[PDB]
Every structure is written in structure tokens, then in C-alpha cells.
């Protein structure tokens, strides 16, 4: 009885995979540079709190 | 009978299952080749997020205090932008003659 | 046999994803609004190149 | 799919403690910010102005 | 999962609250850079302010 | 998630851009924090003098 919902789930999964695969390289480059700036923020936590 | 129904309904979605397999394969390949960035995030971000959660109140207080200063500063500097300019331009000659 | 050896892990996954979806399914319009608001907020700081 | 998902999953499992803690910490931070969102947004706009 | 859903909805609320004043927020970086340059120029162009 | 795919792609690209800009100015960010810690104290002292 829940087979239309299964079909909806599978089609949505395919579409979401396509969208994520299209949006992933930018996300991961941003995550690399965000790792750099997050390391910078962690190294100066006391300065940030005093600020 | 129910197995016949279930197998027919699954077979009607073989193209969508294939497309989902291909899409998941592409996404997982991209994430697998960015596993290095994934590891860097999972090592360096959780401490930052924990610290930010620890000092959320202080950040909110800083933003609100800067906003309290800036509201009055903005109203003063916008209510006097033109009158100050006019007064300076008028006083130029008396200042030179004095 | 391979599925049966990992059957306990698979059904633990099923029960956990069940809790996940049961907690997150109602706020779908909220998620769409969150994505749009995030896009707009990030657009607020990338109007120019630098 | 199996290979790459295994890679990503073992990477996540290696930091499972941090991956578990960051969800709660992010929820706490975001809830604390949401409880003062309107003063925060007003203050940001006033700073810009 | 409850924490995940609560964080998502609260993030949506916070982002909406910030975005409602989106005209002035969108100019925040430009205006802070502009005021920084103006203050730098004002201080640099008046070496005799301290003497006065 | 599928319906707002354009939005997630847009904020992924914007995250990439902002993170790249922040990482490329790492030393500027460090010096900014280092100077922002005492300069607000200086401004506060000057203002409280003429409070």
C-alpha cells in the first residue's frame, strides 16, 4: 500500500543526489578555506573573547 | 500474490533505481575524493563550534552593545550631516578673516 | 548470509533513521525557508568580488 | 558506491565523538542566537547604518 | 535528531530575522570599508591636528 | 531539499567565495583580532574620560 511513497522516495533521492553532486565542489572548497580560518580563530580564542 | 504485486511495482521503478544509483555514485565519488577536507573539517570545526556555544551570550551582548552605540551614533551623524556642512562652509570666511 | 551477519546493524540503522525522519518530517517548509534564507544571507556579503 | 560510502563512513566514525558533540553544541548556539535574533538583527542593521 | 530539527528551525528563524533588514545588512562590509578608508584619510591628511 | 536546490547551490558557491576571501587574508584577520582587543579598550577609556 505504501508503494507510491516508495516511488516518491526513490525519485527524490535521485534528484537530491544530483543536486548535492552539483553543489559539492564549491561546498568542499569553502570547507577547506573555512578550515583555514577556523584554525586561525581557534589559535586566538582568548583574543576573540577579550575583543 | 503479494510477491507478484511487490515485484511488479519494484520493476516499474527500475529506471528510477538506476538513476538513483548513478546519482549516489557521483556524489559519493566527489565526497570520497574530498575525504581529506572532510577529515580536516571533522578535526578543526567541532572545537570552534563548542567554544561558540560556550560564549554565545557574550557574542550577543557584544553585538547588542555595538548596536546600542551605533543607533545613537547614526541618528546623530544623520541629523547633523548637512547642518554641519553648511556651518563649516559659512564659517570658512570668518575663520580666515580672524 | 552476508546480509544476515549484518542484520542487527541494518535494523539498528532502520530504527535510527526512523527516529530521524519522525523528528524531522513535519518541518519541511521550514527547511525550504532555511535554504532560501541561507542563500539570501550569503548573498548579502558577496555582492562584489572582494 | 559501497567503497566510497565506506570511506566517508569510516572517516566520520573516526571522529564520532566530535561529530556527536558538534550537533548538540550547534543546536545550543543556534537556539541561543535565535532567542535574541531580533535585537541581534537590529544591532547589525544599526552598525551598518 | 530532535537537536538536529530544533537547530534547523531555529537557524531558519534567525536567518529570517537577520534578512528582514536586508537592505542595510547587504551594505555592511562596503560601509565598514568605506568608513575605515575615510578615517584613515582624515587622520593622514591632518598631521598638524595634534599641534592645534 | 530538492525543491530548494538552487538555493543550496547558491549558498554553497557563496560559502566558497567568502571562505576563500577569509583564508587569503589570514594574516590580516590575525592582526585585526590582535589590534581589536586593545583598541576598544582605548576608545572606552577616552569616552569614559569625557563621559
Spatial separation of the C-alpha atoms in residues F11 and F25, rounded to whole Å: 21
CB A42 within 8 A of CB F32: no
DSSP at B13: T
Which cell numbers in the block locate residue A12?
A: 527524490
- Cβ contacts of C31 on chain F, cutoff 8 Å: 1, 4
User: How many C-beta neighbours within 10 Å does residue B84 have?
Assistant: 11
Spatial separation of the C-alpha atoms in residues D21 and E8, rounded to whole Å: 16
Radius of gyration in angstroms for the set of CA atoms belonging to chain C, rounded to a whole number: 20
Q: Is the dihedral of CA B12, A7, B25, D3 positive or negative?
A: negative
Helix spans in B1-98 (H): 2-11, 14-32, 35-54, 56-79, 81-97
User: Per the CB < 8 Å rule, is B46 touching D21?
Assistant: yes
Closest residue to C30, CB basis, from E1, E9, E22? E9
CB D23 within 8 A of CB B50: no
Q: Which residues contact B56 (CB under 8 A, 6 or more apart)?
A: D28, D29, D32, D33
Spatial separation of the C-alpha atoms in residues B47 and B49, rounded to whole Å: 5
**B with A: touching (≥3 Cβ pairs within 8 Å):** yes
B74-to-B68, C10, D40, E17 alpha-carbon distances in Å:
10, 60, 17, 21
Which cell numbers in the block locate residue F1?
A: 531539499
Which cell numbers in the block locate residue C42?
A: 550569503
Best of B45, B50, B58 to disrupt the A interface by mutation (most A CBs within 10 Å)?
B45
Backbone angles phi, psi at D35, to 5 degrees: -65, -15
Best of A29, A42, A49 to disrupt the F interface by mutation (most F CBs within 10 Å)?
A29
CB A49 within 8 A of CB B58: yes
C15: left (phi over 0), alpha (psi -120 to 50) or beta: alpha
Helix spans in chain C (H): 2-5, 7-24, 28-43
Instruction: Kindly identify which residue of chain E lies nearest to residue D29, measuring between CA atoms.
Output: E7
Spatial separation of the C-alpha atoms in residues F46 and F40, rounded to whole Å: 10
- Cβ contacts of D8 on chain B, cutoff 8 Å: 28, 31-32, 35, 38
The residues in F 14-43 lying below 8 A from A, measured between CB atoms, are: 15-20, 22-24, 26, 29-30, 33-34, 36-37, 40
Helix spans in D1-49 (H): 2-14, 16-34, 37-48
CB E4 within 8 A of CB C26: no
- Does residue F25 sit in helix, strand or coil? coil
- Does residue E1 sit in helix, strand or coil? coil
- Cβ contacts of F8 on chain C, cutoff 8 Å: 35, 38-39
B60-to-B43, B63, D23, D40, F33 alpha-carbon distances in Å:
26, 5, 21, 7, 18
Amino acid at each position: 500500500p505504501r508503494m507510491p511513497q516508495i516511488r516518491r522516495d526513490i525519485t527524490g533521492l535521485a534528484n537530491l543526489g544530483e543536486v548535492y553532486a552539483d553543489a559539492s565542489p564549491d561546498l568542499f572548497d569553502g570547507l577547506d578555506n573555512a578550515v583555514t580560518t577556523a584554525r586561525t580563530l581557534n589559535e586566538q580564542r582568548g583574543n576573540l573573547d577579550q575583543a | 500474490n503479494q510477491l507478484d504485486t511487490f515485484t511488479d511495482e519494484l520493476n516499474q521503478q527500475r529506471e528510477e533505481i538506476t538513476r538513483a544509483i548513478d546519482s549516489t555514485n557521483r556524489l559519493l565519488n566527489i565526497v570520497s575524493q574530498r575525504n581529506d577536507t572532510l577529515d580536516r573539517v571533522l578535526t578543526e570545526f567541532p572545537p570552534l563550534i563548542q567554544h561558540f556555544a560556550e560564549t554565545r551570550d557574550l557574542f550577543a551582548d557584544a553585538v547588542t552593545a555595538l548596536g546600542r552605540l551605533s543607533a545613537a551614533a547614526d541618528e546623530t551623524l544623520s541629523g547633523s550631516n548637512a547642518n554641519l556642512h553648511t556651518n563649516l562652509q559659512n564659517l570658512q570666511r570668518p575663520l580666515k578673516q580672524l | 548470509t552476508a546480509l544476515n551477519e549484518g542484520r542487527g546493524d541494518f535494523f539498528a540503522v532502520v530504527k535510527s533513521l526512523a527516529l530521524f525522519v519522525n523528528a524531522l518530517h513535519r518541518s519541511d517548509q521550514q527547511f525550504v525557508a532555511l535554504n532560501n534564507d541561507l542563500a539570501q544571507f550569503t548573498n548579502s556579503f558577496t555582492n562584489t568580488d572582494q | 558506491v559501497i567503497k566510497n560510502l565506506n570511506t566517508v563512513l569510516d572517516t566520520t566514525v573516526r571522529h564520532q565523538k566530535q561529530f556527536d558533540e558538534t550537533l548538540v553544541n550547534f543546536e545550543t548556539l543556534i537556539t541561543g542566537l535565535k532567542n535574541r535574533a531580533d535585537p541581534i538583527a537590529t544591532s547589525v542593521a544599526d552598525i551598518s547604518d | 535528531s530532535t537537536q538536529v530539527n530544533q537547530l534547523l528551525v531555529n537557524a531558519q528563524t534567525l536567518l529570517a530575522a537577520v534578512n528582514e533588514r536586508g537592505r542595510s545588512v547587504s551594505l555592511l562590509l562596503e560601509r565598514v570599508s568605506s568608513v575605515s578608508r575615510q578615517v584613515e584619510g582624515f587622520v593622514d591628511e591632518n598631521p598638524n591636528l595634534n599641534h592645534v | 531539499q530538492v525543491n530548494s536546490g538552487d538555493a543550496i547551490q547558491r549558498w554553497a558557491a557563496n560559502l566558497n567565495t567568502l571562505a576563500a576571501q577569509s583564508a587569503q587574508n589570514d594574516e590580516a584577520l590575525r592582526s585585526g583580532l590582535q589590534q581589536a582587543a586593545p583598541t576598544a579598550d582605548q576608545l572606552n577609556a577616552v569616552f569614559s574620560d569625557v563621559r
